[PDB]
Nucleic acid binder design. Structure first.
Lengths: 394, 153
RNA sequence: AAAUACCGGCACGAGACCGAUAGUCAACAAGUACCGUAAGGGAAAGUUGAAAAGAACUUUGAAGAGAGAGUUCAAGAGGGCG
RNA sequence: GUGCGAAUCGGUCGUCCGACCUGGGUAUAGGGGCGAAAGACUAAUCGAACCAUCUAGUAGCUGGUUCCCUCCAAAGUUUCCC
RNA sequence: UGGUAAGCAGAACUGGCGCUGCGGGAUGAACCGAACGCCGGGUUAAGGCGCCCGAUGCCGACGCUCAUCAGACCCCAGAAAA
RNA sequence: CCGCCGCAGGUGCAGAUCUUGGUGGUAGUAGCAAAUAUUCAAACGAGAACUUUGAAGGCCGAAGUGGAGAAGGGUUCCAUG
RNA sequence: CCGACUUAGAACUGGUGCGGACCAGGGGAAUCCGACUGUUUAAUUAAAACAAAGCAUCGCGAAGGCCCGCGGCGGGUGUUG
RNA sequence: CCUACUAUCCAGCGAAACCACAGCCAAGGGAACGGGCUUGGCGGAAUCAGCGGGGAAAGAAGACCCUGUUGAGCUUGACUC
RNA sequence: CCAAGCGUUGGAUUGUUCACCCACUAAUAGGGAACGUGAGCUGGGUUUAGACCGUCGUGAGACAGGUUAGUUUUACCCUACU
RNA sequence: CGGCCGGAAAGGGGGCCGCCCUCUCGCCCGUCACGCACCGCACGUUCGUGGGGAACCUGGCGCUAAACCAUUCGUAGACGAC
């Protein structure tokens, strides 16, 4: 007989295969649609979830009840030191889909990239690209390298650039950098391949890829939570306390005589560590990294137009379970996927960006730099000392 | 007595045998298959590592509910264990077989374990006491082991 | 008295019977072991070899267990063993 | 709930100077006992204990009913019948 | 014959199934053809002959029909008035 | 021990939730989760998470996990191996 | 001069915390049933069932009433009235 | 969300229920609800933790209902004592 | 009419399916899947054994007549699913 | 035999002029006759120095890795895995 009272179905069948993501780094399934009118640009970047803090800005949307009033928005700090372009891959467009035509790597590949090509770097003689490197410093090799670029600006249609993260500049434990094909979307294939060859062994900073007040799609792996029951994994109703064999499960798991159990029925298993693409994540500000000019360091990142402190987005006692953000970061509105330190594939929108909310320009009043490691009271170190006076440790 | 398989030439071969040994048959069949073709010295260091849980025995046939260890991948298998008592019993039997080559004038550190065989022995009967005044058997599954070393450069 | 009866008893002889899941419950330390408060219930269990000649001595092991050697027509019979 | 257990375990309960609890001794025995009565209890057995025998009880009702080939080959209808 | 009907209940005649394989009906106890020792060749029945699948791969004959729910072979497995 | 001619029968098994005995798959699986808790060093010894000694930390907490008995057991007592 | 357990009252005091653990009644307004305590289907029913005091019938003056027993100058009530 | 014991993995030890053969579906027909047949989907070793859809899962020769010229306990205005 | 994409609620009383009412709501449509779904629960109702009542029966007892109390066993196999 | 000039959807055996170059043979008729003419007879004739797997010889041109375990981490985790 029928469902007595109609309730909607618990959980989506969209992401049905609720398994450990086979990749740790978020694959870009779809790059933006290129038009040969535009100038050349990278369409994706590769960041690291440092942490999460407040903002204070004045909202500017007419008609709302928060028009010309201050808000407090949650923001993430994605530390994004500039990525080193170390290769270019061409793709021929075929009736069986889209085939990789030819890869050309750079001459000098940094040991950050080399580490990626080994499971046991310690045990290895580090021979990767030692016979390939020899193609760039003989006449007989340069010839056949330039005939690969010539062959690729003829047949290939989708040019992607290989860029690895600069892992040495981060506070993380690891050194094995993250390689990534980033699609170059721009003019004609010829212009696109002359440009990527020009960028071969170059830093690509994040201001060259992204800009402020830009809606971007964040791709990563979800924070993993292990083997979970149906009440945790699917958020089904908890059964009555008097249940004999357990109140933390789905009671009916099928009708009789569709005499299997359906893929749609909610079972226990792997929660979290699922690959996810969150769209419409706004860039509140792209931050300048720590740099030295005229002897003194510059760290005035959280210095807004109305604050003018000399405090960084590094909170008191650093970002918890991360480290200090000494490099150029992109500050995204709201929470994004994955845990702290999680490699976090940024991507320009797949979607034509035309709203009041999407075209909004963001003028920050106050970035909160209070301690995240407990109920932080003070923004900077000198404020804590100015208020509390001299301690016994002075 | 009478062994199942005969060696190529009895000259370059020594034997050992254990009747009605009180190790599990299944655990010992698996650790006797792992050692089945190895060199006597490669065999001892393997069984000493099984004892220390550094190298595993891949449970290939008798693998019902048997857990998955990382060490099993050395055997191109997913399931493996460290049968300590089974290792130790056919490590006493390598001790004995080595002792017989020594006696026959054979060179020890050229010996390869060619034939090894774990037969089921007569079971020993004990009982367990179960709900509603019932008695069920709690029988041991002991095993006959008999193996033949052979000289191979 | 005799002729008649006699699945107990003491002896015997015999068989187109049974051949160790058969024939008595019992071929054997069987009305035993064991079970039940008791009345009662009630098993399983034959076979080394012609002869113990039942494997000295050596060897590895703490040992059970082996490897040799030896007995024997045979251990392809090694003490619950045709 | 193939248990610790052929009735147990935990919390929570009822009663705790009295128609109180309790050990030993003693009496009542099977269409009998005993019953502040539930067909309760009478040795894990109770709307008639258990044991042996009568007994291989009877069964129009279930189940099974052991080699081969060769030939012939049905009936489920009539009449009477607790 | 009863029943609104029923793969319902009850009769008459004959043939089946049960007791019976075999070709055909995709698949069926009963429909259709045809009843059977073990084989070779030949030929048919009922059914078929795009491919599954043996056989139209004939220069088959004449029409009829377009369905945004086509139609497509006894029993037989799905429709009427309009 | 068997062929032939006769004689005789406790004379042919796949079934009986058959009888008795044996053995599988289940399966190296369920399991070895009631009553707070062990640790360090040494000794004996082929061998020690478990034995013994010492030291620590705990528990029963006199309605005891204490010291004695009655029923019942029948040598379980005690030493040595 | 020997005092041995309490009781009441006051001051001060702590971050209003104090029967600090432990021990240790939720309460009220009503209906139904059985007065109550007691008892009961050991192993699914603790109940409103049974019992109970109170009440009321009935039998019988012993050669008797009630009852037992195969039996008897038998036996229980009955060491009774 | 936290805690204790599990489950979990390992060393050692190690049962049982169950079991024609077995084990992917859809429709068909069929003893009128197939794991096997037909016609289609299709189909890749060996496995671990889970789980309760199915095996018309196991458990026990339906306690219901009917039949039997099968009973029993009980009742009485049944019959015969 | 094309149309099952997406919704179709919170409660009082009742074991209830059903009904009825309150209130919210875009709307508070109707159904199937062994009258989906008890090794998923629950056990309120029916539906054992204890008891009370009414009617019925001489009685034992009967009552889709009320009432109260009443053991919800197993997955570790194969598949399916995760 | 040295180069010129061609070839991405799953890149190929091509076509050109120049020479070091060897013949005036090949193709079509007609001459000269010869070659196991194996005595009537079957898997003959190809692709084919085929595909795959072992080693035996030999001359150039050369190549000096990694994975897994163990340890470690905790962005992961029942165990593997990550």
């Amino acid at each position: 007989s029928h469902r007595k009272f109609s309730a909607p179905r618990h959980g989506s069948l969209g992401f049905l295969p609720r398994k450990r993501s086979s990749r740790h780094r978020g694959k870009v399934k779809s790059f933006p649609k290129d038009d040969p009118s535009k100038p050349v640009h990278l369409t994706a970047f590769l960041g690291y979830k440092a942490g999460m803090t407040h903002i204070v800005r004045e909202v500017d949307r007419p008609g709302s009840k928060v028009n010309k009033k201050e808000v407090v928005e949650a923001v993430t700090i994605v530390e994004t030191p500039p990525m080193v372009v170390v290769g270019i891959v061409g793709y021929v467009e075929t009736p069986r889909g889209l085939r990789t035509f030819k890869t050309v790597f750079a001459e000098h590949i940094s040991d950050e990239c080399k580490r990626r090509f080994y499971k046991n770097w310690h045990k290895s003689k580090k021979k990767a690209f030692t016979k390939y490197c020899k193609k760039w410093q003989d006449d007989a090799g340069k010839r056949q390298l330039d005939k690969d670029f010539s062959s690729m600006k003829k047949y290939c249609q989708v040019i992607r650039v290989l860029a690895h993260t600069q892992m040495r500049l981060l506070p993380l434990r690891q050194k094995k950098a993250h390689l990534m094909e980033i699609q170059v979307n721009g003019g004609t294939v010829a212009e696109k391949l002359d440009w990527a060859r020009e960028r071969l062994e170059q830093q690509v900073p994040v201001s060259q890829v992204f800009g402020q007040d830009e809606m971007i799609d964040v791709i990563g792996v979800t924070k993993g939570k292990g083997y979970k029951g149906v009440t945790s994994r699917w958020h089904t109703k908890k059964l009555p306390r008097k249940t004999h064999r357990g109140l933390r499960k789905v009671a009916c798991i099928g009708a009789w005589h569709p005499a299997r159990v359906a893929f749609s029925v909610a079972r226990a298993g792997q929660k979290g560590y699922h690959h996810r693409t969150e769209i419409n994540k706004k860039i509140y500000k792209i931050g300048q990294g720590y740099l030295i000019k005229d002897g003194k360091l510059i760290k005035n990142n959280a210095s807004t137009d109305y604050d003018l402190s000399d405090k960084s987005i590094n909170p008191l006692g650093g970002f918890v379970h991360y480290g200090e953000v000494t490099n150029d970061f992109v500050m995204l509105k709201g929470c994004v996927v994955g845990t702290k330190k999680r490699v976090l594939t940024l991507r320009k929108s797949l979607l034509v960006q035309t709203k009041r909310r999407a075209l909004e320009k963001i003028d920050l009043k106050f970035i909160d730099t209070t301690s995240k490691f407990g109920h932080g009271r003070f923004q900077t170190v000198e404020e804590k000392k100015a208020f509390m006076g001299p301690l016994k440790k002075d | 007595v009478r062994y199942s398989l005969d060696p190529e030439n009895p000259t370059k071969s020594c034997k050992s045998r254990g009747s009605n040994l009180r190790v599990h048959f299944k655990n010992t069949r698996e650790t006797a298959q792992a050692i089945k073709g190895m060199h006597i010295r490669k065999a001892t260091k393997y069984l000493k590592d099984v004892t220390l849980k550094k190298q595993c025995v891949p449970f290939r046939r008798y693998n019902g509910g048997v857990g998955r260890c990382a060490q099993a991948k050395q055997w191109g298998w997913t399931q493996g264990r460290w049968p300590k008592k089974s290792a130790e019993f056919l490590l006493h039997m390598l001790k004995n077989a080595e002792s017989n080559a020594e006696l026959k004038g054979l060179d020890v550190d050229s010996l390869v374990i060619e034939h090894i065989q774990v037969n089921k022995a007569p079971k020993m009967r004990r009982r367990t006491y179960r709900a509603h005044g019932r008695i069920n058997p709690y029988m041991s599954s002991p095993c006959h082991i008999e193996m033949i070393l052979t000289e191979k450069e």
